[PDB]
Amino acid sequence: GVYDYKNFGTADSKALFSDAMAITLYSYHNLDNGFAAGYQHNGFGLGLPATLVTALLGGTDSQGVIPGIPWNPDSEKLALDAVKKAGWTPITASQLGYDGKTDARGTFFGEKAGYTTAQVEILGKYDAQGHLTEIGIAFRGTSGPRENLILDSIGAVINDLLAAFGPKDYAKNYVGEAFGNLLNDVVAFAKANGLSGKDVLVSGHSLGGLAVNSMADLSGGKWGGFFADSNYIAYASPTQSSTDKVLNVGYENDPVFRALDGSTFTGASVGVHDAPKESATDNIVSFNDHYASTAWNLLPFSILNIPTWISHLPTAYGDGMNRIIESKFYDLTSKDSTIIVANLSDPARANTWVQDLNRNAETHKGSTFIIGSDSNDLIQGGSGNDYLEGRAGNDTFRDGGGYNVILGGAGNNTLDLQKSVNTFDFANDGAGNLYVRDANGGISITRDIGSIVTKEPGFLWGLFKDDVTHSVTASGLKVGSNVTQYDASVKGTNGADTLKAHAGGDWLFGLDGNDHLIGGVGNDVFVGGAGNDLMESGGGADTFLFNGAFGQDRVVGFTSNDKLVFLGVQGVLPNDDFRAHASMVGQDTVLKFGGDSVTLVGVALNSLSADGIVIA
């Protein structure tokens, strides 16, 4: 999964991620809620007030109205409800033995000249009995004063901030300077409650995330090395620590995210700075009204251009990246997966296609995941391999080919094919999956797509030009009266079946159980499903399709004109070739995908070509 951390399980990593995001959001106490609400309702045609950028960096004396970012009446009470729902409760100064101040929210403040506006929330997670199990440290970073930030042009101020981080280990040492004594109290408090460092989660966004990275660098180091084993997840940090300790999460079109090389200002710092970084998620796009806009992108991408900072705002971090977490595709992804998140206003959402524009980014690598919203989305895949997720609402997909998985989720969803119905084949396994094979043999596996739209020259037909809408029924594609039939197939049961193809070619669907798929002399498509399936080619130019937790299969009679299609499987990295997944056991080639496997019986490794082993 894209947020896997250290050696935690996939699931444990996600739970950590969500806690990190919860506490991070809390640290801002709903600062961008007014702006995000206006953006969602109205669009970004008005751009972004320079005052929100200074609020992000400098801190605020609040909670009031400095414009044009709206109130926000209920705001700190909603932020606090939400952090608590996510399982966290602010820890008091008194609980810590802390001598210093906390404001009316329970926020602690920096301790040395130059850090006195730095803030941090210290929160605790308690089991059903009232015992502390975990501590959360959420840095809200500043500089701070709200006071050097108006004496210059906003761009000259951003530029100087950025250049000040690297020299004299300022960014590195930041958390030791600001919170060195507080963190000793946290160490004392944690131990008294039987916690060790592994039970401490460290997060923050922005300058907060700079602080997460700074703590990691010092965790060696200071506080008796108590936090050396703590968990560090930074959002939208400009810096990366030198440790291997921090998961650095961010949107790729966030101008602040990765702006420094470690903490080094470079030529890329004030333009596109999308070179891959070990600790960082490098390919998560916020597909927002700015990113979608020709007009907005007339100016070069730069952190010095305030409108670019819309991609930095925390509410969209929360909301979009929680939809990654929630994805049916989540466990196919890895740290650098290309992920396009639908982040558009209501106005733009009605008429803009969410797609990988690859704008202000280095060229994307591997398969593309596109995650919709709970509203009606327009989602367009490319002619590569794409995993399209509609989530709730009535979504419409398009896709330019390749190998794909299209999930429409809740609602009434449609796949617009934008070619003729005659140039595609359709199959249907009776277990909810409808398969679409294109004229180039690219296959999409679809769920919850009730309607297909084709562009008939036409006639076809029939009565109906030009675009025509087919209902997806058990017996085929129904345009009112006519059926466009499903390709010939044999369907099994969820037990162990033996299925036999006809000489003309069949789609063979074993479904669950350990099946025995005996193809014939024709061009068959083998889908063994869950279970450990024995599939024989029988002749022909055959296709073996593997999706999900496909099990430990055996393929017999595999030749040069046959194809293994791996789609929606475990253990794949951007640009994997089969040679990464291949070994030999006697005269058989074994291909492993996480804990799934295909043994090609009596096929020597060296005889295999990448053209008939598609890894999507």
| Joined tokens for residue 165 | 């981080």
State in angstroms the smallest separation of the CB of 180 from Ca ion: 31
Cβ proximity to Zn ion, 193 vs 394, nearer residue: 193
| Binding segment toward Zn ion, per CB under 5 A, in 121-129, 191-199, 441-449, 547-555 | 121-129
State in angstroms the smallest separation of the CB of 130 from Zn ion: 8
Among 101, 103, 104, 129, binds Zn ion (CB under 5 A): 129
Q: Does residue 94 touch Zn ion according to CB under 5 A?
A: no
Give, in degrees to the nearest 5, the angle at Cα 328 between 14 and 125: 25
Cβ proximity to Ca ion, 124 vs 492, nearer residue: 492
CB proximity list for 464: less than 8 A, separation 6 or greater: 456, 458, 479
Cβ proximity to Ca ion, 59 vs 539, nearer residue: 539
Residues in the interface with Zn ion (CB under 5 A) total 2
CB proximity list for 372: less than 8 A, separation 6 or greater: 342, 354, 379, 388, 389, 390, 391, 393, 395, 409
Q: Does residue 609 touch Zn ion according to CB under 5 A?
A: no
Contacting Zn ion within 364-403 (CB under 5 A): none
Q: Does residue 363 touch Zn ion according to CB under 5 A?
A: no
The C-alpha atoms of residue 56 and residue 79 are separated, in whole angstroms, by 16
Residue 317 and residue 32 in contact, taking contact as beta carbons nearer than 8 Å: no
Residue 369 and residue 572 in contact, taking contact as beta carbons nearer than 8 Å: no
Question: Using CB distances below 5 to 8 A depending on partner kind, what does residue 129 bind out of Ca ion, Zn ion, none?
Answer: Zn ion
Residue 177 and residue 217 in contact, taking contact as beta carbons nearer than 8 Å: no
State in angstroms the smallest separation of the CB of 48 from Ca ion: 23
Residue 167 CB-density burial (10 A; 0-12 exposed, 13-18 middle, 19+ buried): exposed
State in angstroms the smallest separation of the CB of 440 from Ca ion: 11
Q: Does residue 198 touch Zn ion according to CB under 5 A?
A: no
**Catalytic-residue membership of 560:** no
Cβ burial 583-592 (10 Å sphere, 16+ → b, else e): eeeeebbbbb
Q: Does residue 130 touch Zn ion according to CB under 5 A?
A: no
Q: Does residue 602 touch Zn ion according to CB under 5 A?
A: no
| Joined tokens for residue 130 | 């009232």
| Amino acid (1-letter code) at residue 148 | N
Cβ proximity to Ca ion, 409 vs 458, nearer residue: 409
State in angstroms the smallest separation of the CB of 517 from Zn ion: 8
| Joined tokens for residue 361 | 């980014």
The C-alpha atoms of residue 378 and residue 389 are separated, in whole angstroms, by 11
Question: Using CB distances below 5 to 8 A depending on partner kind, what does residue 221 bind out of Zn ion, Ca ion, none?
Answer: none
Cβ proximity to Zn ion, 361 vs 521, nearer residue: 521
Positions of E strands within 118-195 = 119-126, 132-140
Cβ proximity to Ca ion, 136 vs 372, nearer residue: 372
Q: Does residue 131 touch Zn ion according to CB under 5 A?
A: yes
Question: Using CB distances below 5 to 8 A depending on partner kind, what does residue 131 bind out of Zn ion, Ca ion, none?
Answer: Zn ion
Q: Does residue 481 touch Zn ion according to CB under 5 A?
A: no
State in angstroms the smallest separation of the CB of 155 from Zn ion: 53
- Tell me the CB-side half-sphere exposure of residue 91, using CA atoms within 13 A: 27
Question: Using CB distances below 5 to 8 A depending on partner kind, what does residue 492 bind out of Ca ion, Zn ion, none?
Answer: Ca ion
- The binding site for Ca ion (CB under 5 A) comprises 252, 274, 276, 280, 282-283, 336, 361, 372, 377, 381, 386, 390-391, 393, 395, 399, 402, 404, 408-409, 411, 413, 492, 497, 510-511, 513, 515, 519, 524, 528-529, 531, 533, 537-540, 542, 550-551, 553, 559, 561-562
To which H or E segment does residue 249 belong?
A: strand 246-249
Q: Does residue 112 touch Zn ion according to CB under 5 A?
A: no
State in angstroms the smallest separation of the CB of 547 from Ca ion: 9
Cβ burial 528-562 (10 Å sphere, 16+ → b, else e): bbbbbbbbbbbbbbbbbbbbbbbbebbbbbbeeeb
DSSP 8-state code for residue 264: B
Cβ proximity to Ca ion, 283 vs 337, nearer residue: 283
Question: Using CB distances below 5 to 8 A depending on partner kind, what does residue 204 bind out of Ca ion, Zn ion, none?
Answer: none
The C-alpha atoms of residue 357 and residue 212 are separated, in whole angstroms, by 31
Q: Point out the catalytic residue in the list 206, 241, 373, 537.
A: 206
Question: Using CB distances below 5 to 8 A depending on partner kind, what does residue 10 bind out of Zn ion, Ca ion, none?
Answer: none
Residue 367 CB-density burial (10 A; 0-12 exposed, 13-18 middle, 19+ buried): buried
State in angstroms the smallest separation of the CB of 556 from Zn ion: 7
The set of catalytic residues is 206
Interface with Zn ion (CB under 5 A) = 129, 131
